[PDB]
Design a protein around this ligand. Structure first.
Ligand code: CLA
Ligand code: CLA
Ligand code: CLA
Ligand code: CLA
Ligand code: CLA
Ligand code: CLA
Ligand code: CLA
Ligand code: CLA
Ligand code: CLA
Ligand SMILES: CC1=C(/C=C/C(C)=C/C=C/C(C)=C/C=C\C=C(C)\C=C\C=C(C)\C=C\C2=C(C)C[C@@H](O)CC2(C)C)C(C)(C)CCC1
Ligand code: SF4
Ligand SMILES: [Ca+2]
Lengths: 107, 80, 63, 165, 37, 144, 733, 39
């Protein structure tokens, strides 16, 4: 209720360190308005260790996404018939992506 | 009506005639270029001033030149 | 065989030409009596993207 | 001294501004514990502020009634009254660097122009040649005078295109 | 001396800015729409 | 080849109509009528918007301006390799054949055609405007 | 069918669309383009049009005099010009609410009225006007003068009174008359009014057509004038204790050279202005005897120009052929007149504020602000017009064969050099003037104002020192009491001048610092950029590499189509249109600078400008935001005040300015297709289809849209600033 | 590798590298010589 969320710290150069405002909690930085602090609290994160572990996970996922992109274009490229399976695509996106995603989040 | 003029620099490419969307130009027999044909503008009254002919003209400078002039129902391309 | 030699470099003299005071290569000269028999090719394209044009013998000079 | 200005070293407004600046930083240094990283940072800014006000005064800068340093740009007043590090020397420093960039770039364009595809050497930079010219650009001023004196720097009007007039 | 009455504005302002504009617009519109003999 | 006569009772391509059709100008000033022969029923695009089915053999359509007729003329010739012809029709019953004027499309050089609006000079040989000043009206050195 | 309007262009008269109405109005004063136009008829039409313009100007002045004498408080303002607010005219609005009537009731009450910011009250008071009878008589006279110019206009166009083209071409005779009579005799007649009426009125003596002959302008009469004892006329001038309008502290001199300002009025001395007009009158009358007309003596302008050719060939054929070039080109003649009048208009703005000629003018801050901004904006438009006509001259009148090798043709031969150099200067000023402001803003934002770049305007301060100001300690010329320039003028004007130039409460050579340095370079940026745009338009008006035959298309044409990469805004008219934005930006910067420096001086804290003008946040917060409070509170949920009209106008200008953006950003094609849909809707709507249009509705043309957008943009620009300027100055003072 | 070095020689890449070098040089200078107003 008193400490202002801050997650960007600037280097002390050409006098720009003034932007590191007194946000509270013995911390100096730029006040953020993305709402991440409240999202992380809602998710139940209570340590910077959990935030660091998710960051590493996201990079592992980013590497996987870039791999998938290279693999599905240079190694195993789906044919047009595959992409034209709209009935199958909707069944998986409604049941898997959306319904499973919502079920997992409820967990 | 807009003033359309053809110049001796014409090479008889017929591109302007093919580009015209109102049939203002045509090819007439000539002896000034190797193609033995030169562009002519016998229906300028139907010209709107799109200048597509000039865009199609490849000579430097243009062999076909359009000078926007008096405005009419045809010149303004009005369907009303 | 009137006109400049093929493959020779000539400078344009036509004032309204994009390549005025610029040098191009003589692609071919029409021996037939055409108004502009010298076909010249240029490296730089004009505003229309064209890189060739026909000029009269007087409009061109070895350079 | 000049223009009725006064040395920052003797200006009272210059002194009040330095106190005003340090008092803002100090009002903030209080809310933090002595060794706290926030405290260390505010202290380093206070030291940098003290050094700036001292370094500027030592450089003999003049200050207006606003208590802020004013720069003398007249070559005559600057040299006679000790104010040449403010605009004069900076001018010859910039002119050397700016001419350096220009002469090297001109040398590059001239070199790639005699190649098969100059346009290709402008989108893909011939790094080795570019690095060579970059190092040889230190003596550009003498090279520029030697080109100006050989009449090789400029182009003949007869070879430059112009509109009909 | 060359002084208009108090009602001047109560009459001049209405005439100039409403009545005269209407009259001017009417004649002008007619002339433009008129065609050469 | 002779100047063709427009048969006004020609069958029109199948089309339910649109809102981009003729306006009051067709009844007061003039309208345009394109005609062509189709070797097979093919759906085509109306220059005024919408799909329409050309009928076997003769076909007739009416457009508000010449550009719309030539636009349809372009599609039929380029896509279906057909050879259409169009006319300008006045409200008094008068019909005027327009394209192809001589039965040979303009891009193809044809004899008999006499050059018009041609200048035996390059544009750079035009006089300065000061020379054509105070003439009967505003004119360009090119017009002289 | 062919409509009657316009009668000057059958082409337009045969246009069946709404464009005919717009173009008929837009091309009515372009006589050269009218059907069947001859050079002689061109001159006669212009001559009559000029009489018409004069008629309108004199009626405008008569109208102004009448409303002040009938609805204002001139006879009350003269009694207390320091605390009485001048009334422009009465307000009769039936849409007003009882509160608005009370808010606008002022200046001696008498109902709702507008206060005058024109400065006619101080002007007429200074020239001797003292009563509404005097104002009424003047109004009648000027109304009569207007009718004569209107009749002369009508007559000099009737047969047996239509001057020949040769008369219009008699340059040597016209210049002799305009210099000796229009300028010299007029100035001499003005000296007579000042000496016989204005000065006696300032000394408390009424001098009117009733007693002007039985009154002596000077106690010694004209004996000093005809004996050569002119100095006598300078003896015994008004003293520092002179109460303007009374014989208190009043002297007897009629021509002096005191210099500086009258102590109470803070304006120039009437005796100094009388002597000024007398001296310039003599100079002009003499100058009017230089050209040869009919008596065997005088110069032939053609011979003069033909002789001015540098012997080294540095200027080619020199000024050969220029006589005929100028004499046969009205556009060339108009270009020079606009360029000269426009520069002179800016001088009026700079000199009237620094050396106020009218009594109690410098204390009327609102009038001072209004006059400077008004003349600086009119000057900007005139300068733009000058280049526009220079570009038209090149396209319509320039004949290369008759100007071969001359200075004019040389200009065209190095146009790329001229333009490229104007491009370089503009770039330098723009990059550095912007870079220094941004650096200063960042230094202010990071809380380090001692780190900002503040270059002292030493070169300008040195000039001010030369003129006498000793604040900078340069000690030279008038600032040096041991200088000859100081001693020679010690018994003439210097004393009064030095007192004024050393007083930091007037506007005579205001003190300048780093903020003034930055804004002056911003003004230089605007002047060079606007000139670059205008010059480039005139030099490329006849042709370019993209359009080599532009001359065959005329001054104003939409474009040359999308071919050749695209050719939007390629005409010289398009260059003028783009230059107007830069001119408005330039006059905006200059008027902002003038207003802010005076607001701070008038308030008594020049330090605010000196410390806030060095960064753009300072301009936005300490000038625009801070000075807008009272104006935006002209009307609010709690009521309205006399500033309500300005609050409403301020927003009215913002609306027109933004409406211009629509004509400037959105182009014809989109609108033409929208109108076609409406034409279908009207013809398909029952009952509505019964009524029809005589002119086929069409979207505005490309050139028309650029003009309509620029007009809306320009009108909102002026209305917005005028509303802000008057409100900020009046409300604060 | 030759094609990769040619790609690294492309205008945008060289600009990023050159500007990063120039920016870095200026930043480091102000890091070791803070508040430089005069020579
Ligand atoms: C070392 C790995 C590698 C290599 C050698 C190649 C090589 C090739 N790829 Mg490829 N690709 C890869 C990985 C790789 N790819 C991956 C991981 C993906 C998944 C995204 C793809 C997806 C892909 C597609 C869809 C296509 C290619 C194509 C091609 C061929 C020509 C295009 C090209 O590469 O030009 C070089 C292109 C670039 C260098 C652009 C880089 C794009 C990045 C990802 C954008 C980054 C933007 C940044 C995040 C934000 C910028 C903001 C700004 C403010 C700075 C070429 C032989 C094209 C082809 O087959 O030829 C027609 C083709 O269409 N690739
Ligand atoms: C349970 C089945 C399933 C799931 C979960 C997904 C999920 C997704 N698909 Mg998809 N798809 C499926 C089946 C599925 N698909 C089938 C059967 C077909 C063939 C008809 C397609 C064809 C298809 C196309 C053509 C496209 C997608 C795309 C996408 C992505 C859209 C981005 C988004 O909104 O989500 C947000 C993103 C996330 C939540 C990140 C998490 C994603 C992880 C990897 C979940 C795993 C998904 C994957 C299908 C699982 C198998 C991986 C395995 C082969 C190694 C998304 C992650 C779009 C895409 O390009 O994605 C790259 C797209 O264009 N899909
Ligand atoms: C570019 C515009 C410009 C302007 C507006 C000025 C303006 C001024 N300069 Mg200058 N100066 C300039 C460029 C300029 N300078 C350049 C490019 C140089 C490099 C050589 C110099 C070198 C220079 C010197 C050495 C001196 C000045 C001085 C001065 C001041 C008096 C000079 C004078 O009498 O007339 C104006 C001068 C010019 C228009 C051009 C150059 C200045 C001349 C050549 C110097 C002659 C000064 C002379 C001795 C008068 C001062 C007497 C005494 C007080 C020394 C004056 C305010 C004098 C001064 O006040 O020093 C304290 C001085 O001695 N300037
Ligand atoms: C260019 C000169 C000029 C101008 C700008 C004005 C402007 C104005 N006059 Mg005016 N007037 C003038 C000359 C002028 N007058 C002269 C020469 C006479 C002597 C015949 C008068 C006699 C006169 C009278 C008797 C009245 C006005 C009134 C008005 C105001 C009413 C506005 C309106 O449209 O209604 C009427 C406009 C007019 C009668 C003059 C037309 C001028 C327009 C603007 C051109 C207005 C501000 C009225 C007023 O005072 O409102 C408070 C009013 O009663 N005028
Ligand atoms: C003594 C002889 C004489 C006089 C007095 C005039 C006077 C005039 N002639 Mg003219 N002319 C003459 C002889 C003369 N002419 C001869 C012999 C010929 C044949 C060769 C011509 C051929 C001729 C032509 C073709 C034209 C004129 C025109 C004009 C008018 C110019 C309009 C104008 O700009 O306003 C007046 C100009 C001035 C008063 C000059 C002063 C301007 C300064 C810069 C203003 C400064 C004022 C002061 C500083 C501040 C004022 C503050 C306060 C009072 C507001 C003007 C009233 C024009 C015309 O007809 O207009 C209707 C025009 O077209 N004349
Ligand atoms: C003595 C001064 C003077 C004279 C005699 C002329 C004379 C001429 N000019 Mg010109 N001009 C001048 C000054 C002058 N100009 C100035 C100062 C400028 C800069 C602004 C210009 C800029 C200019 C341009 C760009 C052009 C001309 C053109 C012309 C010629 C025909 C245009 C015309 O008059 O048609 C009629 C003029 C009009 C109908 C005016 C148009 C309407 C404008 C936008 C005013 C609208 C303002 C509006 C009322 C504001 C409302 C606010 C309210 C609601 C509160 C003509 C011979 C044109 C030309 O060269 O011919 C081809 C042309 O292209 N002038
Ligand atoms: C705030 C609006 C604005 C600004 C800033 C400018 C600025 C400029 N105009 Mg312009 N103009 C404007 C509005 C504006 N105009 C409008 C509304 C019109 C009417 C349509 C015109 C019409 C106009 C014309 C006709 C001409 C100009 C010209 C110019 C240039 C004059 C030379 C100069 O000053 O160089 C100074 C340079 C600058 C001020 C730019 C600053 C450098 C940048 C900001 C630094 C880089 C930042 C960073 C490193 C990288 C940012 C990008 C990032 C994504 C990486 C100049 C850059 C003239 C011209 O083209 O010059 C030859 C000219 O011909 N203007
Ligand atoms: C403040 C600037 C401004 C304003 C006022 C408008 C206004 C309008 N725009 Mg527009 N626009 C603008 C800027 C502006 N635009 C800019 C900068 C762009 C560039 C992106 C565009 C691009 C744009 C497009 C592409 C379109 C519009 C359209 C419209 C119209 C929408 C229909 C409508 O609301 O009619 C009602 C009129 C109003 C709401 C104006 C209010 C005026 C007041 C309330 C009336 C007062 C009348 C007064 C009493 C008359 C007496 C005066 C007296 C002297 C006699 C509308 C009039 C659309 C259109 O054409 O219409 C369908 C359209 O398609 N605009
Ligand atoms: C033309 C515009 C301009 C100019 C002249 C300057 C000039 C200056 N700025 Mg600045 N700045 C500008 C624009 C400009 N700025 C803009 C637009 C911004 C906003 C992005 C900033 C933001 C900014 C900051 C944040 C700071 C500066 C600082 C400085 C000063 C540091 C000088 C230095 O680095 O030491 C000298 C460097 C050298 C001598 C190296 C020369 C280059 C090569 C390596 C030398 C080779 C020679 C052979 C200097 C006087 C710094 C300062 O402390 O202000 C006093 C600083 O803190 N500027
Ligand atoms: C060699 C070089 C290049 C330069 C090429 C060329 C041709 C540059 C042209 C220079 C020309 C023609 C200059 C012409 C006139 C210059 C003049 C009159 C000099 C004005 C300078 C003045 C008045 C000095 C002002 C001051 C001095 C003493 C320094 C400071 O104190 C500031 C100030 C203003 C007080 C290329 C190719 C751009 C590439 C790159 C390297
Ligand atoms: S401007 Fe358009 S309509 Fe006119 S001749 Fe050229 S292509 Fe045809
Ligand atoms: Ca009196």
């Amino acid at each position: 209720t008193h400490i202002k969320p801050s997650a960007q710290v600037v280097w002390p150069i050409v006098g720009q360190e003034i932007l590191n405002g007194d946000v509270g909690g013995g911390f100096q930085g730029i006040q953020i308005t993305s709402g991440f602090f409240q999202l992380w609290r809602a998710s139940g994160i209570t340590s910077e260790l959990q935030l660091y572990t998710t960051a590493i996970g996201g990079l592992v996922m980013a590497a996987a996404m870039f791999f998938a992109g290279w693999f599905h274009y240079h190694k195993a490229a789906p044919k047009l018939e595959w992409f034209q399976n709209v009935e199958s695509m909707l069944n998986h996106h409604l049941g898997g992506l959306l319904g499973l995603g919502s079920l997992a989040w409820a967990g | 009506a807009h003033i359309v003029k053809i110049y001796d620099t014409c090479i008889g490419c017929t591109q302007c005639v093919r580009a015209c969307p109102l049939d203002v130009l045509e090819m007439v027999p000539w002896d000034g270029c190797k193609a033995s044909q030169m562009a002519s503008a016998p229906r300028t009254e139907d010209c709107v001033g799109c200048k597509r002919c000039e865009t199609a003209c490849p000579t430097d400078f243009l062999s076909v030149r359009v000078y926007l002039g008096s405005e009419s129902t045809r010149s303004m391309g009005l369907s009303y | 065989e009137v006109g400049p030699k093929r493959g020779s470099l000539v400078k344009i003299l036509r004032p309204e030409s994009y390549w005025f005071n610029q040098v191009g290569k003589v692609v071919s000269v029409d021996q037939s009596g055409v108004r502009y028999p010298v076909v010249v090719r240029f490296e730089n394209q004009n505003y229309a993207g064209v890189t060739t044009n026909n000029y009269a013998l007087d409009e061109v000079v070895a350079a | 001294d000049i223009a009725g200005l006064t040395p920052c070293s003797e200006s009272k407004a210059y002194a009040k501004l330095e106190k005003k600046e340090l008092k803002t930083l100090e009002k903030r240094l209080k809310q933090y514990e002595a060794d706290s990283a926030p405290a260390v940072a505010l202290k380093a800014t206070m030291e940098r502020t003290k050094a700036r006000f001292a370094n500027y005064a030592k450089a003999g800068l003049l200050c207006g009634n606003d208590g802020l340093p004013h720069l003398i740009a007249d070559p005559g007043l600057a040299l006679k009254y000790g104010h040449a590090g403010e605009v004069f020397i900076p001018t010859f420093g910039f002119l050397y660097v700016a001419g350096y960039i220009g002469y090297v770039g001109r040398q590059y364009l001239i070199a790639v122009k005699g190649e098969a595809k100059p346009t290709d050497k402008e989108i893909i930079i011939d790094v080795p040649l570019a690095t060579k010219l970059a190092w040889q650009g230190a003596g550009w001023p003498l090279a520029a005078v030697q080109e100006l004196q050989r009449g090789t720097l400029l182009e003949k009007e007869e070879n430059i295109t112009v509109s009909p007039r | 001396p060359f002084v208009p009455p108090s009602w001047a504005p109560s009459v001049f302002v209405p005439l100039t800015g409403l009545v005269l504009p209407a009259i001017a617009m009417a004649t002008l519109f007619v002339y433009i729409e008129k065609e050469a003999p | 080849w002779t100047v063709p006569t427009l048969n006004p009772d020609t069958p029109s391509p199948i089309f339910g109509g649109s809102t981009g059709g003729l306006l009051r100008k067709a009844q007061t000033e003039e309208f345009y009528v394109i005609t062509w022969e189709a070797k097979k029923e093919q759906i085509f695009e109306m220059p005024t918007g919408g799909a329409a089915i050309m009928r076997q053999g003769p076909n007739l359509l009416k457009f508000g301006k010449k550009e719309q007729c030539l636009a349809l003329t372009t599609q039929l010739r380029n896509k279906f390799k057909l050879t259409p012809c169009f006319y300008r029709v006045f409200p008094d019953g008068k019909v005027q054949y327009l394209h192809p004027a001589d039965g040979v499309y303009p891009e193809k050089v044809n004899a008999g055609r006499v050059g018009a609006n041609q200048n035996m000079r390059r544009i750079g040989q035009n006089v300065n405007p000061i020379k054509v000043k105070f003439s009967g009206r505003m004119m360009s050195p090119a017009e002289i | 069918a062919t409509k009657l309007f316009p009668k000057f262009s059958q082409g337009l008269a045969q246009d069946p669309t709404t464009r005919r109405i717009w173009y008929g109005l837009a091309m009515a004063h372009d006589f050269e383009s009218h059907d069947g136009m001859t050079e002689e008829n061109l001159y006669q039409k212009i001559f009559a049009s000029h009489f018409g313009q004069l008629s309108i100007i004199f009626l405008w002045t008569s109208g102004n005099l009448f409303h002040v004498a009938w609805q204002g408080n001139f006879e009350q303002w003269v009694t207390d010009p320091v605390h009485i607010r001048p009334i422009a005219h009465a307000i009769w609005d039936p849409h007003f609410g009882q509160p608005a009537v009370e808010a606008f009731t002022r200046g001696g009450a008498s109902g709702p009225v507008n206060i005058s910011t024109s400065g006619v009250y101080q002007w007429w008071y200074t020239i001797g006007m003292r009563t509404n009878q005097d104002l009424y008589v003047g109004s009648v006279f000027l109304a009569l003068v207007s009718a004569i110019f209107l009749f002369a206009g009508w007559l000099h166009l009737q047969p047996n009174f239509q001057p020949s083209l040769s008369w219009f071409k008699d340059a040597e005779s016209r210049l002799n008359h305009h210099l000796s009579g229009l300028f010299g005799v007029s100035s001499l007649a003005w000296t007579g009014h000042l000496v016989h009426v204005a000065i006696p009125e300032s000394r408390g003596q009424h001098v009117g057509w009733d007693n002007f002959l039985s009154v002596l302008p000077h106690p010694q009469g004209l004996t000093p004038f005809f004996t050569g004892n002119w100095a006598a006329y300078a003896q015994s001038p008004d003293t520092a204790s002179h109460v303007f309008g009374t014989a208190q502290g009043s002297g007897q001199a009629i021509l002096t050279f005191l210099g500086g300002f009258h102590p109470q009025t803070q304006s120039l001395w009437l005796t100094d202005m009388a002597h000024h007009h007398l001296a310039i009158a003599v100079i002009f009358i003499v100058a009017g005897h230089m050209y040869r007309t009919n008596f065997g003596i005088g110069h032939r302008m053609q011979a003069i120009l033909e002789a001015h050719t540098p012997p080294s060939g540095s200027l080619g054929a020199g000024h050969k052929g220029l006589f005929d070039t100028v004499n046969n080109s009205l556009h060339f003649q108009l270009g020079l007149a606009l360029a000269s009048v426009g520069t002179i208009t800016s001088l009026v703005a700079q000199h009237m504020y620094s050396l106020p000629p009218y009594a109690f003018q410098a204390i009327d801050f609102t009038t001072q602000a209004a006059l400077y901004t008004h003349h600086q904006y009119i000057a900007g438009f005139i300068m733009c017009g000058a280049f526009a006509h220079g570009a038209i001259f090149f396209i319509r009148d320039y004949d290369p064969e008759q100007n071969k090798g001359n200075v004019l043709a040389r200009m065209l031969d190095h146009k790329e050099a001229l333009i490229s150099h104007l491009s370089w200067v503009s770039l330098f000023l723009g990059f550095h003037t912007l870079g220094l402001y941004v650096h200063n803003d960042v230094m202010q934002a990071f809380g380090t104002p001692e780190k900002q770049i503040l270059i002292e305007p030493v070169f300008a301060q040195w000039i001010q020192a030369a003129h006498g100001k000793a604040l900078y300690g340069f000690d030279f010329l008038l600032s040096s009491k041991t200088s000859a320039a100081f001693a020679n003028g010690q018994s003439l004007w210097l004393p009064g001048w030095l007192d004024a130039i050393n007083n930091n409460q007037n506007s005579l050579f205001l003190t300048i610092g780093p903020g003034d340095f930055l804004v002056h370079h911003a003004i230089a940026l605007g002047l060079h950029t606007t000139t670059l745009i205008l010059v480039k338009g005139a030099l490329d008006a006849r042709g370019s590499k993209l359009m080599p035959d532009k001359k065959d298309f005329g001054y104003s044409f939409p474009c040359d189509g999308p071919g050749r990469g695209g050719t939007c805004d390629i005409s010289a008219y398009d260059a003028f249109y783009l230059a107007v934005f830069w001119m408005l930006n330039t006059i905006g910067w200059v008027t902002f600078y003038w207003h802010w420096k005076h607001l701070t001086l008038w308030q008594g804290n020049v330090a605010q400008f000196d410390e806030s003008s060095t960064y753009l946040m300072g301009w936005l917060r300490d000038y625009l935001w801070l000075n807008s409070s009272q104006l935006i509170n002209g009307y609010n949920p709690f009521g309205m005040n006399s500033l309500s009209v300005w609050a409403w106008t301020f927003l009215f200008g913002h609306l027109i300015y933004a409406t211009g953006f629509m004509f400037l950003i959105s182009w014809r094609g989109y609108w033409q297709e929208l109108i076609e849909t409406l034409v279908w809707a009207h013809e398909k709507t029952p009952l509505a289809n019964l009524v029809y249009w005589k002119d086929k509705p069409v979207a505005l043309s490309i050139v028309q849209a650029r003009l309509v957008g620029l007009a809306h943009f320009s009108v909102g620009y002026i209305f917005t600033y005028a509303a802000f300027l008057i409100a900020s100055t009046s409300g604060r003072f | 590798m030759k094609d990769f070095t040619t790609y690294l020689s492309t205008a945008p890449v060289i600009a990023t590298i050159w500007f990063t070098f120039t920016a870095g040089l200026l930043i480091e200078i102000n890091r070791y010589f803070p508040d430089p107003l005069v020579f």
